[PDB]
From a paper:
SecA is a cytosolic ATPase composed of multiple domains that undergo a series of conformational changes associated with the domain movement during the cycles of ATP binding and hydrolysis in the sequential translocation of the target protein through the SecY channel.
The crystal of the CDSecA2 and ATP-γ-S complex diffracted considerably worse than the apo structure with a notable anisotropic component. Correspondingly, its structure was less well resolved. Nevertheless, the electron density map for the ATP-γ-S ligand unambiguously positioned it in the active site. The structures of apo CDSecA2 and CDSecA2-ATP-γ-S complex were very similar as they aligned with RMSD 0.85 Å. Binding of ATP-γ-S did not lead to any considerable conformational change such as opening of the PPXD. Crystal packing of CDSecA2 requires contacts between PPXD of one and NBD1 and NBD2 of the adjacent SecA2 molecule, therefore larger conformational changes of PPXD would disrupt the crystal lattice. As evident from the CDSecA2-ATP-γ-S complex structure, the highly conserved residues involved in ATP binding and hydrolysis were positioned within Walker motifs A and B at the interface of NBD1 and NBD2, and are present in all SecA homologues, including CDSecA1 and CDSecA2. As in another SecA the opposite side of the gamma phosphate moiety of ATP-γ-S contains the conserved lysine (K106) in Walker motif A in both SecA1 and SecA2 in C. difficile, and the mutation of this lysine is lethal, suggesting its essential role of both systems. From the CDSecA2 structure with the bound nucleotide and residue conservation in structural alignments, we thought that the requirements for ATP binding and hydrolysis were likely similar to those of other SecA ATPases.
Numbering used by the authors: 1 to 771
Write the structure that this text describes.
């Protein structure tokens, strides 16, 4: 079992050990000073790895002094392992919180910024508060990212050398960090290196659901209303149209009416894009479309119509604000709720780190997933002292009452013997149910229902001592330790001889992993302990995932009340049920990660092409590129497409971005598509020269960024929410052999081209059409 991987690793610790004595003589400052010595050496030569022995050795004595926690080889091996970029499988109570110190320090010497992710706020704040004396003492700084944290403070934390926090906030922050307008609000920093505590939990387990930021539609609510009232008051002269090419615009009569109606007196400018966009689809919905032709009004809602059948294309909603507009138009309750803006799985958010790593107590079994996703290599480490415990069997039953009384009675029994027990549950109500019998009978205990992880954290530590009964859910008091004695050497041996801590799990969990975690809370290093599972036939995991066996047994009749069950075949069935929800879950992540890849490739560019604008990167060759793009398109459409519809081609460009009287070109019949476009484009290069010369190349470029970036946001968020609705729409399909994913990709590919186009034709319009 990973013998040589650990053996070679052992050579590293072997060296760390020889060094120890030399540093022993050193003062507190002779040690801090070393952080610098380190940094400077890194510039002169040596790799982070070439430093490893001394680096960790320095964390050893500094740790060995400010917290007492000197480090044990296993805690060193694991330290090296995190730095090597893998998983550090150590069992509960093995000291993982400290296995991290040595590795952060080492990597934090680059000034880049290390990341330590935990399962929750408390776990992170506590983790940082504990090891900070080691970090601080060595000339480094630490910060932790907690929930509802103001931007000002939040910035400072990533600024610090080391940073801790809930997995939810790191990936969350990021979203806002890339979703934000200017940089006065970006909060993150370079995602360089991360250490994931309880890696199986965040990565493998959470994976199932993605992170999603949404937005409260207060603004939009009365916005379509105002726009719709105005478009309503508007006259035929206030706008011009063309149902032939499905376009419409607001004439000069409208610009002023809008400025007079609203308090906005400028319009057309990037500042206002909003009122303008809204009044736009408000107008289009009012005249370009019509009742019973385009869209239809059934009951209290407005459904869309398909042109290929005349049927109602249900499920699908109108694009970029349109439906919301038609709704306002007719006079029906508007769907203004849950706006999905940001979204991301941990499968990818974590892929975004130069060097990934983590620790846990159960991962080598899921290695194939950890590697073929995060290319995380699980390396198992030996436990410090030999692990002696009693991982007892699964007391099998039928009927929850039978299972429950068996549990209640076995607890009164262990309790009198004087030993503590840990009753693991998997529901706040089940924990209360099991609680009722104990109270009904008269035996003291406390309920840890994962809500105030800190208050409960204290409770579980004490739980580990003398006559205590603690019923915790599978998420209550996690990183806390079960010290036999609760801090006393007296109760330590008393409870040590009595046979450790006892663990009883209500039902078999969703995986062997979660179960061994209840089993793991006991028997650390060198402590006796027992753990047993009181299972029953109606427990869902078996009830639904068991098979034909549990069914007939459950159906039969009734006989031996309170009498437990057994059989070879019975167990053979109980295990398939768990490995069945194991595989069920294996594939739910598969069909969540892929659906994200599609949006991840998109979100990838929309983001780079968003960051260009922010870090003052030149966008002139690119805007000009898309400007040419619009025209090359006009080419295939009217130029070549229909045949040579000059009136249309020109209407399209006047429609799109060209001014009023400009594209006048001789030749036409004598000239070819390309030449005609080269001309239309030179005519455009001139239009921009008029702009630069009359505005100043600087405002011209400065303005280039103001509107490119602004329209991306408007059309991107809407493309995202809509890409989600697209997924929901595939649900009502299947066909002969049409993969539900395949369709989603195609209808998502062109949907991306439509989005990008809505940007091409929009940056330019604002950049040329009016000024
Ligand atoms: N080398 C050590 N010497 C003394 N105490 C130690 C040492 N290492 C860890 N501890 C103690 O062990 C307890 C912490 O164990 P943890 O770090 O929680 O182990 P773990 O359960 O693997 O970690 P989590 O829950 O993934 S942080 C604390 O009471 C520490 O004081």
């Amino acid at each position: 079992a990973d013998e040589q991987e650990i053996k070679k690793l052992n050579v590293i610790v072997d060296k760390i050990d020889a060094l120890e004595d030399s540093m022993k003589n050193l003062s507190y400052e002779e040690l801090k000073d070393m952080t610098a010595i380190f940094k400077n050496r890194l510039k002169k030569g040596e790799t982070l790895d070439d430093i490893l022995p001394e680096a960790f050795a320095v964390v050893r004595e500094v740790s060995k002094r400010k917290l007492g926690m000197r480090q044990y080889r296993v805690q060193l091996i694991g330290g090296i392992v995190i730095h090597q970029g893998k998983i550090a499988e150590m069992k509960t109570g093995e000291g993982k919180t400290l296995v991290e110190v040595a590795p952060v320090y080492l990597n934090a010497l680059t000034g880049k910024g290390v990341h330590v992710i935990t399962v929750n706020d408390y776990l992170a704040e506590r983790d940082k508060e504990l090891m900070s004396p080691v970090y601080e003492s060595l000339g480094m700084t630490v910060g932790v990212i907690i929930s509802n944290q103001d931007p000002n403070i939040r910035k400072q934390q990533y600024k610090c050398d080391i940073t801790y926090g809930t997995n939810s906030e790191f990936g969350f922050d990021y979203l806002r960090d890339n979703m934000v307008p200017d940089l006065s609000h970006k909060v993150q920093r370079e995602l360089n290196f991360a250490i994931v505590d309880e890696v199986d939990s965040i990565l493998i387990d959470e994976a199932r659901t993605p992170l999603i930021i949404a937005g409260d539609g207060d603004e939009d609510l009365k916005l379509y209303e105002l726009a719709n009232s105005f478009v309503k008051t508007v006259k035929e002269e206030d706008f011009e149209l063309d149902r032939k090419d499905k376009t419409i615009a607001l004439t000069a009569s409208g610009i002023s009416k809008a400025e007079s109606f609203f308090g906005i007196t400028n319009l057309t400018d990037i500042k206002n894009i909003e009122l303008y966009h809204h009044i736009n689809q408000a107008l289009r919905g009012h005249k370009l479309m019509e009742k019973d032709v385009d869209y239809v009004i059934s009951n209290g809602e407005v459904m869309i119509v398909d042109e290929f059948t005349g049927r109602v294309m249900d499920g699908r909603r109108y694009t970029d604000g349109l439906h919301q507009a038609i709704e306002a138009k007719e006079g029906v309750e508007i769907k203004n709720e849950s706006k999905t803006m940001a979204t991301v799985t941990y499968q990818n958010f974590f892929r975004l780190y130069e060097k990934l790593s983590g620790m846990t107590g159960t991962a080598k079994t899921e290695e194939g997933e950890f590697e073929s996703i995060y290319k995380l290599n699980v390396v198992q480490i030996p436990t410090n002292r030999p692990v002696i415990r009693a991982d007892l069997h699964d007391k099998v039953f039928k009927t929850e009452e039978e299972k429950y009384s068996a549990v209640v009675e076995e607890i009164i029994r262990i309790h009198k013997t004087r030993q503590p027990i840990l009753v693991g549950t998997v529901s706040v109500e089940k924990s209360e149910k099991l609680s009722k019998m104990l109270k009904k009978q008269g035996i003291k205990h406390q309920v840890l229902n994962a809500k105030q992880h800190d208050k409960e954290a204290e409770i579980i530590s004490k739980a580990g001592k003398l006559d205590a009964i603690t019923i915790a859910t599978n998420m209550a008091g996690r990183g806390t330790d079960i010290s036999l004695g609760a801090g006393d050497k007296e109760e330590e041996q008393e409870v040590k001889d009595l046979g450790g801590l006892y663990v009883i799990g209500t039902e078999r969990h969703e995986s062997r992993r979660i179960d061994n975690q209840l089993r793991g809370r006991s028997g650390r290093q060198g402590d006796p302990g027992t753990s047993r599972f009181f299972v029953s036939l109606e427990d869902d995991v078996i009830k639904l995932y068991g098979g034909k066996t549990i069914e007939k047994l459950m159906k039969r009749t009734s006989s031996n009340e309170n009498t437990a069950i057994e059989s070879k075949a019975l167990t053979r069935a109980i295990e398939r049920a768990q490995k069945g929800v194991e595989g069920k879950n294996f594939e739910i992540r598969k069909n969540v990660l892929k659906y994200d890849d599609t949006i991840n490739e998109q979100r990838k560019v929309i983001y780079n092409e968003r960051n260009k604008v922010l870090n003052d990167e030149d966008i002139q060759e690119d805007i000009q590129k898309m400007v040419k793009d619009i025209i090359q398109e006009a080419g295939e459409t009217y130029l070549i497409g229909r045949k040579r519809d000059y009136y249309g081609y020109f209407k399209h460009l006047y429609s799109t971005f060209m001014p009023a009287d400009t594209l006048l070109i001789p030749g036409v019949d004598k000239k070819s598509v390309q030449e005609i476009i080269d001309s239309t484009y030179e005519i455009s290069k001139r239009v921009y020269d008029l702009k630069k010369m009359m505005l100043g190349i600087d405002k011209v470029a400065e303005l280039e960024k103001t509107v490119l970036l602004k329209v991306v946001d408007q059309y991107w968020i809407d493309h995202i929410d809509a890409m989600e609705q697209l997924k929901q729409y595939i649900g009502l399909k299947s066909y002969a052999q049409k993969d539900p994913f395949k369709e989603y990709a195609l209808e998502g590919y062109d949907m991306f081209e439509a989005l990008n186009k809505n940007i091409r034709e929009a940056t330019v319009q604002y950049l040329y059409k009016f000024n």
